[PDB]
Design a protein around this ligand. Structure first.
Ligand SMILES: [Mg+2]
Ligand SMILES: [Mg+2]
Ligand SMILES: [Mg+2]
Ligand SMILES: [Mg+2]
Ligand SMILES: [Mg+2]
Ligand SMILES: [Mg+2]
Ligand SMILES: [Mg+2]
Lengths: 59, 142, 55, 94
RNA sequence: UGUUAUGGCGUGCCUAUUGAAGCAUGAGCCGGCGACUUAGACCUGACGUGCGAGCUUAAGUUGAAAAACGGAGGCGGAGC
RNA sequence: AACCGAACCUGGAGAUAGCUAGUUCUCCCCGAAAUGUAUUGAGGUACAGCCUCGGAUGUUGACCAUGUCCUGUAGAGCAC
RNA sequence: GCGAGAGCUAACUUCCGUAGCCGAGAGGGAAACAACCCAGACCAUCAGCUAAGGUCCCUAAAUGAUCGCUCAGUGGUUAA
RNA sequence: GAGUGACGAUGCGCCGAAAAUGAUCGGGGCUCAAGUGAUCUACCGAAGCUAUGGAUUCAACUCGCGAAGCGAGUUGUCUGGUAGGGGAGCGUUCAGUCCGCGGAGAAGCCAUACCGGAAGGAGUGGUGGAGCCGACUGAAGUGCGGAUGCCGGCAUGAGU
RNA sequence: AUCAACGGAUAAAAGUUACCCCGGGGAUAACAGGCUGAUCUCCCCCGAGAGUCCAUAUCGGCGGGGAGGUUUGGCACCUCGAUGUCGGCUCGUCGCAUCCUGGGGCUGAAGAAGGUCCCAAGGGUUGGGCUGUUCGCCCAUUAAAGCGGCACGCGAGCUG
């Protein structure tokens, strides 16, 4: 359920779960994992920030 | 703990079928019908959008429309109650080709069946505008 | 010589289970520093395919 | 979470797995992994600068569960009790 | 706490068996009844206690709101 | 005397039953076998093997290396 | 599975050898599915990483990147 | 007027290719790869590994005690299981002992969201209307879903 | 001591049961199904030779590759606390490897009548004599008087 909500929002900001998570992993600093689904669902402002950070640590 | 929903929204989408490969189009509709990007993101109920298909007759099929694509639909006690039709032969029902490809990629239970109410297929372009008094937010395939 | 059990002992021949026991590895992930002696290098070659070898 | 919080909570008295600092106001400081304090959003190690402050409210046993196990035609039936121990913590930090 | 919608998951029980949801056996349901015991101065072992290089009584006898007596005999004690 | 290749009733009698069924509170620790040889034996049984508990011993057990000996399969070959 | 006999170089066949699993083994995968593949379940959690297997929708996760092949739905019924 | 004909190797494909209830690769659908050869990463994915909390087994190490040993307490380790073996206990009747309770309400019955690791145990309330709980120790006709089990009551078929 | 049934039951011992009885076994046969497919049925390959001449209009030695699952079997997996067993009748439905009828190609097709192969399962596929018969033989017709599956389809449907 958690993963489903993540890639839904990840795809809202031109990404996807696979990619997004790798970004947060590549930005070692980011280790949300648990909680991460609620941010996507309730805090869209905040979720976007984490998408933008994930995009950096990758490409 | 995890977040649940509301229902104040009922998004209506207007996908065009024109030249899109059948299954390729189908996928987009089935996902937007279930809960792809999902409002509150929950599976105990329907969060899905009301897809409206237009240009059903102008849909695309690869190497075989004449051969291979055969809609088997076997009637009452099969006392040779075995009916088959080529996809080309579905010039009678273009709306049922899209319809009975999309339902094929949907859950099949009590809820799943409830989901075929959301899909509303039409063969025309300007004439489908029947169920088009609510929202008409056009979303292209890819 | 760093050695770690990466594959399960289930479905693997007796001798290989007995070797993996001698090497003191009890779970998957279990890692240990190893001797460069011919017999201890010899144990590690018997069950090579079940272990991840660093050096 | 995995034990020991994070996040932009408020002044909430939540329940977590046992902390050892027995009795009331045993004071606990939390690492923090994200925050929305004053709408300002910041994540990992940049959030690590900041910390959360907690006060050990109580020590308790979680609602009794019963661990039941069954294997068919083997006459295998198991019945055992269970109660998970927790530490309730009042949040009141940065 | 009760109840309810929808989602996921999900092959009664026992027996017998290489293999039971099995279209193999049994059983309508509930209540009650319903299956490893007792004996012997028997044999052999674990635990235990009392005396201990020794230990012990049987039948009986006398007292019985109760136990004492009774050494006939039995076992260690030498084997081949 | 409503079921006769030897009536019915009571008893011996809880006949025998290597066969079928059934065998009831709980948690914990270990945990098999379906093999070998014999059997008027082959769906039974004796001894071993395999399990478990207690005692003794206390590295003798396991794997792997080295050293040594044993061996006629795979392949090959046509000297029998 | 591997190594043989029997058998038609048949059998979900039979009888040995040898390894592993089921028997007594739950969990993931293989649609479903004792045995195959991964992996051996002390209990709790609305945490994290991986195996075999996967990442269009049903269904978790790239409708991934690059150079090629096939146009028969081959893929997704065997030979001379 | 510019290349063209034959033996062979190989990759993927073609024909050869007919069985009985209705079809299909699980399905939808797929060549505008969701097929397929090769290389490469990123994610999913189990009761495996990991995080945190707790319990058990064996062990070595501390100690409460007149000693062994039993309790506690670390640390390590263990904990799938059929036949079977080993350990610790729960419950029922009767008994001896002690502490009690009861017509201002005993047993039994009924309801319940409480306690204990389990067998189980308590509180409160309701019924009942005269006996009974707890603790230690002793003894058993001591624990049932099965036996086409026995006795009894009541269902189904059926308003047939 | 051919106690040789050779770890040797007594010194001493054959048959029969359709009159049969009990305890069991799907540990084990007969029916059906399942797996297999030797045999069975069909189809394909090669082309010796027959066809006055010409391998292939028809035919196809010796030999080779498949398919089917209707035969006889093999095997012994569910069923022995019961899966009624041949034929008929009644009732159907389904495969096509098509008996008729429909469309074709080749012919050793002048025509008419055929032969043979391909496509095709819509409907059709007679009544008697003999035998329990399925089968088969005969009589008399027919466009034709098909071969198979469905527990050798069908007994809580009938016969016996
Ligand atoms: Mg039986
Ligand atoms: Mg009797
Ligand atoms: Mg071949
Ligand atoms: Mg009963
Ligand atoms: Mg048969
Ligand atoms: Mg018969
Ligand atoms: Mg013709």
């Amino acid at each position: 359920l958690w993963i489903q909500r993540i890639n839904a929002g990840a795809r809202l900001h031109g990404m996807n779960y696979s990619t997004f998570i790798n970004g947060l992993k590549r930005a070692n600093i980011d280790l949300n994992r648990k909680v991460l689904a609620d941010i996507a669902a309730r805090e869209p402002e905040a979720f976007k920030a984490l998408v933008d950070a994930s995009r950096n640590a990758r490409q | 703990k995890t977040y649940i929903p509301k229902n104040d929204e009922q998004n209506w989408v207007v996908v065009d079928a024109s030249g899109v490969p059948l299954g390729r189009l189908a996928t987009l509709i089935a996902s937007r019908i279930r809960g792809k990007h999902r409002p509150d993101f929950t599976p105990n109920m329907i969060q899905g959008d009301f897809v409206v298909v237009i240009n059903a007759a102008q849909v695309a099929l690869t190497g075989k429309k004449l051969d291979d694509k055969v809609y088997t639909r076997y009637t009452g006690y099969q006392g040779g109650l075995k009916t088959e039709t080529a996809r080309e032969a579905l010039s009678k029902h273009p709306e049922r080709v899209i319809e009975h490809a999309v339902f094929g990629m949907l859950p099949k239970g009590r809820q799943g069946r409830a989901m075929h109410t959301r899909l509303k297929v039409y063969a025309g372009e300007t004439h489908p505008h029947s169920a088009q008094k609510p929202q008409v937010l056009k979303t292209q395939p890819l | 010589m760093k050695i770690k059990l990466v594959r399960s002992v289930i479905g693997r021949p007796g001798n290989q289970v007995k070797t993996v026991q001698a090497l003191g590895l009890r779970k998957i992930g279990d890692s240990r520093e190893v001797s460069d002696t011919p017999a201890v290098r010899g144990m590690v070659k018997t069950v090579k395919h079940l272990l991840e070898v660093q050096e | 979470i995995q034990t020991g919080g994070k996040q932009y909570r408020v002044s909430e008295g939540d329940v977590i797995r046992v902390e050892s600092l027995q009795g009331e106001a045993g004071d606990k400081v939390e690492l923090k992994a994200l925050f929305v304090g004053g709408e300002q959003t910041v994540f990992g190690e940049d959030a690590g600068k900041y910390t959360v402050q907690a006060e050990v409210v109580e020590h308790g046993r979680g609602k009794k569960i019963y661990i039941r196990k069954y294997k068919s035609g083997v006459q295998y039936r198991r019945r055992t009790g269970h109660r998970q121990n927790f530490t309730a913590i009042k949040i009141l930090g940065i």
